[PDB]
Amino acid sequence: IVDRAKMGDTLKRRFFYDQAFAIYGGVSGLYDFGPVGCALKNNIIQTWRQHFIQEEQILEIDCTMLTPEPVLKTSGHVDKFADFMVKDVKNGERFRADHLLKAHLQKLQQELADLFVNFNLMFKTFIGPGGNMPGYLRPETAQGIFLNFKRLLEFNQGKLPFAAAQIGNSFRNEISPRSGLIRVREFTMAEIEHFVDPSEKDHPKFQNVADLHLYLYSAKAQVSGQSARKMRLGDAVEQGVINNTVLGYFIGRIYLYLTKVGISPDKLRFRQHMEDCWDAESKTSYGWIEIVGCADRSCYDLSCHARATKVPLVAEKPLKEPKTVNVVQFEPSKGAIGKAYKKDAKLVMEYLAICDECYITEMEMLLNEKGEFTIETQLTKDMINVKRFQKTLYVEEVVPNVIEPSFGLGRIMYTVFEHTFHVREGDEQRTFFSFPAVVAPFKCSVLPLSQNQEFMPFVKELSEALTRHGVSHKVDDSSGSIGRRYARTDEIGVAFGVTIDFDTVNKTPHTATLRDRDSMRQIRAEISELPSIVQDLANGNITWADVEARYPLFEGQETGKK
Amino acid sequence: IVDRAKMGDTLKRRFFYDQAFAIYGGVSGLYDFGPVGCALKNNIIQTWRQHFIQEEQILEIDCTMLTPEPVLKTSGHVDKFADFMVKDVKNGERFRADHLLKAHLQKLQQELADLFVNFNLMFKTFIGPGGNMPGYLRPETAQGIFLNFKRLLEFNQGKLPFAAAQIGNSFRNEISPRSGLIRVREFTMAEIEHFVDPSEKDHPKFQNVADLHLYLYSAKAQVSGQSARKMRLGDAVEQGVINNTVLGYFIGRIYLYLTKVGISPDKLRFRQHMEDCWDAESKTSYGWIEIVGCADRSCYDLSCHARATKVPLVAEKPLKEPKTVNVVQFEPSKGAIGKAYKKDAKLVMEYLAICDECYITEMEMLLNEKGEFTIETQLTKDMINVKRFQKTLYVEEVVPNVIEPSFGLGRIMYTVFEHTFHVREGDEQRTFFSFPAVVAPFKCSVLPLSQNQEFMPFVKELSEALTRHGVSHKVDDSSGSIGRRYARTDEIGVAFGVTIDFDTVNKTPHTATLRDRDSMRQIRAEISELPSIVQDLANGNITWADVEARYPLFEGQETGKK
RNA sequence: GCGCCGCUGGUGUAGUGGUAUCAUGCAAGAUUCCCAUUCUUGCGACCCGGGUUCGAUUCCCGGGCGGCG
RNA sequence: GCGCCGCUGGUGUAGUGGUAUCAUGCAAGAUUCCCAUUCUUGCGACCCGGGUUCGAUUCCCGGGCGGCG
Ligand SMILES: Nc1ncnc2c1ncn2[C@@H]1O[C@H](COP(=O)(O)O)[C@@H](O)[C@H]1O
Ligand SMILES: Nc1ncnc2c1ncn2[C@@H]1O[C@H](COP(=O)(O)O)[C@@H](O)[C@H]1O
User: Fold this and answer.
1) Same domain, yes or no, for A153 and A79?
2) Residue B150 to residue B313: CA distance in whole angstroms
3) Is A187 in the pocket of ligand 1 (CB under 6 A)?
4) At which residues is Phosphotyrosine found (chains A, B)?
5) Which of A373, B3, B80, B547 has the smallest C-beta neighbourhood within 10 Å, fewest atoms?
């Protein structure tokens, strides 16, 4: 129901984006974003920062894309995403472990290569030249957040919960990329890691989103061949469809964000993972695609890296009431025991630790009646002191649960394309994008009605004033009609237009016309006040309905050349 | 004169940045930026966008980091930055071409490897798995701008001048990185390509910067063992020290930018290239380091890529007055001539093109007296028509000159560190950063004077109000003294502080105290007005002197617990 | 790459062939009520691999990382 | 990877063993004076490598890129 072909022509022609290295014939899965697309991506990301990082006071960090092999071996990406296959003399690549299992001889480490005589989706490289340290381009931005967990917890003064975020590119050496921007080899990701006490799974700010009505696609609905269904968010948590208000909160603000940047609510749903994690999916001409992933990496990455580095990655919680504990434990001279016995005493300490307090005090009872006991599979003298004592714990070690919202900016952008792309009534040559003002490429088009020179002082002052207000704009003063210019600026989604006519130059206070992209409807206002108005529009402070409600609507020019 | 050690301790401790993959032992030349550093980098970049991209209406684009081999072969990076050497059985890597030239046999393509039996600084990888398409991580961000030149010129309606920019990471497989952030393997660059008619080398906006007084380090000053010297910018262009006002303009706004983000003017100079291009250099504890590069890639990249792709990369200018030209040229039947002769006729057209009009009309004069002539090193019949005619040119092809300002954000940031780092008088434990407000990590610290609970409603409303104003802040409500909190927030360069005391809770309208980081001086204002004030501070709309000039200064608390 | 010495809580340090001192920091409770206050209590560390040894943080070798060329 | 047909100005097309049609777009000058107006003039293209041929954009082979599995 979206003319994907027509839309793609507009995206290509106006250079929203294009095939990377196109003049060299191009490369699959690689794309350059041109002025308008890059402006859009930067607005989407800017909006994202104010949404998530600013509102939740999230700790943003910036790690390298370059990653050494061990890190991704520990995280399981090396085995999961990689192996090595065999190729036919003249094309026809086949899996190795596969064809080994299939059995025969050949065709149709290198120890295995020698064995036969009887491929990684991660981009691989080498750090330092000479290449003694192999590495990869990171396939996600999360690992950099896990590696810095101690530093990040310390910045938050050791307290939970907290969240870290990363906004940056990731790489995926894809087999055969199709689907335009949807399955690409390099893409910009926005990843949040929200660390929480597993016991404090309640969000204080959930009441902010409980009233939203969302399309939820439960696992039960999926198994039972049902369709997704609209629910009040609060109801969904209350009835247990969404497990808790931490998950719920995160869902609500994701929804608010996707809709804020122009994704249609009716072509947006949240799909539950089945045999807690919900994914944001949008409906496109390619069908339902995942735009926001969700993972729960509790007992996974922190643990792996902890085990691999021997660096304890854990939070630490104070106990309201300190627990005291009786401790009956053996206190063996390491020197004495190790000197008297040789491989013996390794096994003898392999043993003494594994003993009940009963056994222990029987042992020392045997030892105060001078002065030595003996044991299973060794005769111990006083190379063994014994010890009992009170031991108070003021703090318990908390292994944080992690929630991982993973945003694919490319898919989000493409989704915005399909959902905001339109053609006009009549002149179908005239296509436009309904980008919401907070993210449109430019806020304002600045245009004179005719090529007449009496216009240009007004255009310049106006352009200068807009730049002064930090309002991205674009002046279109070219040699054609108002209508050709309005077509060109609408085509790239410029949200508003300011036309400077004869009434601007001739009339007693200077007023120009402000035009809405979607409606083409206009109002008229003092040329010195319009920057602020466009500014309120771009900041989402006011609506177009709000503008029509405050200013005189356009009922024609009163003047002409004079 | 800067305690680099003390400063580095503060940068490490508060996690401005840290060694990448530190828990895995770390990797040289790779760094992660923590919350404060990442906040700073994002502000520097945001400021940069409003400076250059917005003010000059520059075309920002976003290309991939992944780059295929041919592109960098054509640009000369493959031969310049790469080769292949030989290694000793137990360490001791030596150049190849080198040791071949040195002569002997061995030690102390693969055709060469076989020959001996008698290293790239670019990060190398393979696109697609199976690896039939070798590539690199881009070492700069410029190539993506050159490859899209047609698309970018078209977006600017074929007209010159224009400028494209890119903000993104680049990679450099460095031999031995030292010098902290200064010589790293991955770094974020901000690159501008300004395309200009070589004949229109005058900037209309130069008068905006002509009054700046800058330290200029001319080539003549360098050769003649002189020091850099302060000059009025306009004077420098007028006296020919700086060739033109395009270069001059760009220098002035670079200066304004570097100073805007906190680089001391007195430890900032512009160094001319010697046997036009000036580089911005800042004075640090490592001495004078280059922070902004400048290149002139006129007749270089566009040409190379043009030659390699056979795609003409050129601007096109209309001629005020169309030139008419007489054209006397041979018009040879390709078929006739090629059928009658076999390798002969290649050489015969190798020839006919190379002939003067005199010779031509002598030839046709020989041919109208029926009906065939003959030539050096072949007898031509009517397989040769001849032709004269008027040929008007309405447009001349312009090969754009390019100016390339290349900003090293890491070096810029580090420079800001050394230039804004300070220790206080007395308590030297108390170090702070004089980040200018427009770029400080947070604008505002929100703090209560004591742990008393009557404070927390005020802190929350205030925090919420700040977020509503889009003001990055950080609430510090921890268990120590006002002074320990003010130390912690000063240490990371929080520009302002808002303390909520007993006078805030007890007194008839609610006012709190606003504190300047540098001076520690304070004023007192209504808690509902402070977000806007901090906002004006952060946007550079007002100074601290401006604040003291408007509000009551802090002369003590009037109330206490009650 | 080569050479020069190092690597102990988050930061800086003591010391050791038998798991470790002091300071700061942070956390908690008191105290204080405008500039790292004071007291009590608590958390947290021997860079990694191999070797010799009964056992290495300590001795040796090799990596990694840093400083000085 | 395999298979299925393609690739001609920025966009879309005509056609061809001897360098190419029309439209749009953009540029310029007129015209118009609020929604791709009209007229004139101008700019801009055969995806890349190899083969056969005197010569390939055209035929064949192989890449690259796209569509359909
Ligand atoms: N190959 C790709 N191209 C573009 N976007 C992707 C790609 N792979 C993943 N994504 C996006 O990144 C998110 C996280 O995916 P993953 O990390 O694979 O679970 C997804 O929800 C997508 O939006
Ligand atoms: N290895 C590096 N590490 C950090 N910054 C760099 C590095 N190389 C270059 N730069 C920065 O990038 C700018 C351009 O350098 P170049 O492209 O090498 O001329 C310089 O002025 C530096 O600020």
Assistant:
1) yes
2) 7
3) yes
4) 286
5) B80
* Pairwise CB contact (< 8 Å): A152 & B123: no
- Number of domain units in chain A: 2
Whole-angstrom distance, CA of residue B242 vs CA of residue B284: 25
Strand D within 7 A of A131 CB? no
Considering only CA atoms, name the residue closest to the C1' of nucleotide D68: A178
- Smallest Cα–Cα separation from B504: which of B562, B443, B445? B562
What resolution (Å)?
A: 2.9
CA A167 → C1' C67, Å? 34
Whether B143 and B214 map to the same domain: the answer is: yes
CA dihedral in degrees (A274, A279, A280, A283; nearest 10)?
-40
How far is CA B313 from each of CA B19, B150, B305, rounded to the nearest angstrom?
43, 7, 8
Q: DSSP of B428-464, one letter per residue?
A: TT-EEE---TTT-S-SEEEEESSS-GGGHHHHHHHHH
Indicate the top mutation candidate among A121, A301, A406 to test ligand 1's pocket, ranked by most ligand atoms within 8 A of CB: A406
Those residues with Cβ within 8 angstroms of residue A207's Cβ, 6 or more apart along the chain or in another chain: none
CB atoms within 10 A of CB B203: 20
Confirm whether any atom of chain D, the nucleic acid strand, is less than 7 Å from CB of B480.
no
C-beta of residue A65 within 8 angstroms of C-beta of residue A172 = no
B345: Cβ under 7 Å from strand D?
yes
Distances from the Cα of B173 to the Cαs of A78, A131, B82, B189, in angstroms?
A: 23, 10, 10, 16
Q: List B residues 33-92 in contact with A (Cβ-Cβ < 8 A).
A: 33-35, 37-39, 41-42, 49-50, 54-55, 57, 59-68, 70-71, 87
For the record, the structure tokens of A190 come out as: 């926005």
- Do residue A394 and residue A489 come from a single domain? no
Residues A178 and A139 in one domain: yes
Same domain flag for A493 and A525: yes
Same domain, A289 and A418: yes
Give me the count of residues in chain B. 562
Q: Are residues B482 and B401 in the same domain?
A: no
**Closest CA in chain B for residue A69:** B24
Q: Which of A255, A185, A166 is nearest to A27 (CA)?
A: A185
Tell me the three state secondary structure of residue A128. Answer: coil
**Domain closes at, from A411, A434, A457:** A434
Cβ B346 to strand D below 7 Å: yes
Statement to judge: residues A430 and A440 lie in one domain: no
Mutate to test the interface with B, among A10, A13, A18, A21 (most CBs of B within 10 A): A21
What was the experiment behind these coordinates? X-ray
Distances (CA, A) of A512 to A61, A167, A485, A559: 45, 40, 16, 13
CB neighbour list of residue B279: distance below 8 Å, 6 or more residues apart: B270, B271, B272, B273, B290, B292, B293, B294
Identify the domain containing residue B546 by its residue range.
Answer: 435-562
Q: Which of residues 493-522 of A touch B (CB under 8 A)?
A: none
Give the domain CATH number at B542: 3.40.50.800
- Show Cβ contacts of residue B21 under 8 Å, excluding neighbours closer than 6 positions: A67, A68, A71, A147, B27, B30
Residue type, B163: A
User: Which two tokens mark B481?
Assistant: 């003294």
How far CA A502 is from CA of A220, A314, A451, A524, in Å, comes to: 65, 70, 12, 13
